[PDB]
């Protein structure tokens, strides 16, 4: 049968980038032509494979990761990138084989007064390994003194909200991202 790419791209709600979702796609025939033959993608960057010739090379496994990030953070969803998202939320390996797909979701995910449900990790003691997922809400110590799970001063809660509002500039608007790994 056919692969469930509609379940991923057309989902009513996307995950926060710190808790990015991963759907393992197995035992199906993928119709990749329709995906690229869509003008509604503002980012469609493939690495190691050509988007037109997606069904001509070897298939390790097919993973579909999805989340929502800021507009000016889309440039971090790529190999070798640094920044808050690539270091502390979602990291692509240097030898990445797949495609990064993103589109503006301002009319879906931003609310008047702020949609605070979408979060990202702002602090961490070390960068994430490729494809590592971190959902811990332990208090982060930025100073010399311990915190003992208490929030204050140089002790920060590690997660921050985007608070998407539709009147934000495009750099702060929500973007839905789908990473296809092969």
């Amino acid at each position: 049968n056919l692969c469930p790419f509609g379940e991923v791209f057309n989902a009513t709600r996307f995950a926060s980038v710190y808790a990015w979702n991963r759907k393992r796609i197995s035992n199906c025939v993928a119709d990749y032509s329709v995906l690229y033959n869509s003008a509604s993608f503002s980012t469609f960057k493939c690495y190691g494979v050509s988007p037109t010739k997606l069904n001509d090379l070897c298939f390790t496994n097919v993973y579909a990761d999805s989340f929502v990030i800021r507009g000016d953070e889309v440039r971090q969803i790529a190999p070798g990138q640094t920044g808050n998202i690539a270091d502390y939320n979602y990291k692509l390996p240097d030898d990445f084989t797949g495609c990064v797909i993103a589109w503006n979701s301002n009319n879906l995910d931003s609310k008047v007064g702020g949609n605070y449900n979408y979060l990202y990790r702002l602090f961490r003691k070390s960068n994430l390994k490729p494809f590592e997922r971190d959902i811990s809400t332990e208090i982060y110590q930025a100073g010399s003194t311990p915190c003992n799970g208490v929030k204050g001063f140089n002790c920060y809660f590690p997660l921050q909200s985007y608070g998407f509002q539709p009147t934000y500039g495009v750099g702060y608007q929500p973007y839905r991202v789908v990473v296809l790994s092969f």
Partner: antibody
Amino acid sequence: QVQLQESGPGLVKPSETLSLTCTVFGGSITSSNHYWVWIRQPPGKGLEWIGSMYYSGSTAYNPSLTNRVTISVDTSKNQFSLKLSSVTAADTAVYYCARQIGPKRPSQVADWFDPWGQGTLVTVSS
Amino acid sequence: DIQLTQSPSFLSASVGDRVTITCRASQGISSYLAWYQQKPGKAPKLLIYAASTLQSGVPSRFSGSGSGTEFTLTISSLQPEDFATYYCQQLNSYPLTFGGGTKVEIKR
């Protein structure tokens, strides 16, 4: 200079539905940095915020008005409207439409109202 | 819900007097405050936003100041046309809320 011209019936029977419309002049309603709002003022009382709306659909309503408030936008006519259902005498007020400036950045000072419609008195009575 | 308490409810000052109106928020909202002037039968008119930024087209005798919980609107020289009810508004949190208003009468 943006102008707002509201219209609608000033008399609504109890349990019926109030309905008012605001027409934007000197500027398009598909503004990417403004909300379109409604504010009411009971006679001799203060101001109460009703709701705000982005042209593409998203709304924010006052939880004090339960689920009887609907705002809508007609981009093709440069209008936005207010519908308040199951009205009582406690809904008799001068209703204003206004333009609210939205923030462009997280934690930016915005959300003030300028300009305003002239105000329409709606009396709830049979 | 952020509640704004405006003091006094009424005041009566002479032309040329210096008038001061207070708006106290139930919590600290930094500088997320605006001031409005409403004359009889008219819609409210924006005077100050961001606590102290004067709106383009407002006389310089109007001024706002304050931060945190207490804010003040000052009319340095009261004029006869300044007869109005002045409202503060918090612009930080939803739902958006106004103060109760201060009605300013002219003494003559």
